[PDB]
Point group: C2
Amino acid sequence: RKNIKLTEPIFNKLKALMKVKDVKQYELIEIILDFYVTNKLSEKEREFFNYQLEELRKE
Amino acid sequence: FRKNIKLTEPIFNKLKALMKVKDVKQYELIEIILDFYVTNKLSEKEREFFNYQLEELRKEE
């Protein structure tokens, strides 16, 4: 429901990466989220992420 | 904050869940996952074009 507020340097980096790929803005956020979840969280961090995500979907 | 973005429900839910795993503000989390992707997933040619656009968005201010 609410917008997500960004600083101008962060908005600029999102717009620049938008140019590089060929995707809608929210689709880009999902790609980079997924990439971070898969390649940067520990095993236990990712299990808690999955858990939290399942809780939000029943909220 | 002048700038903002909208997200669909499913993407917003993934951003909120990752917020609960890290301990940073929304805009910081966005930056962290942007930078991680830029550094690790872009080829050298995409990265060059990313840096150029970033210089172009600076000029056009």
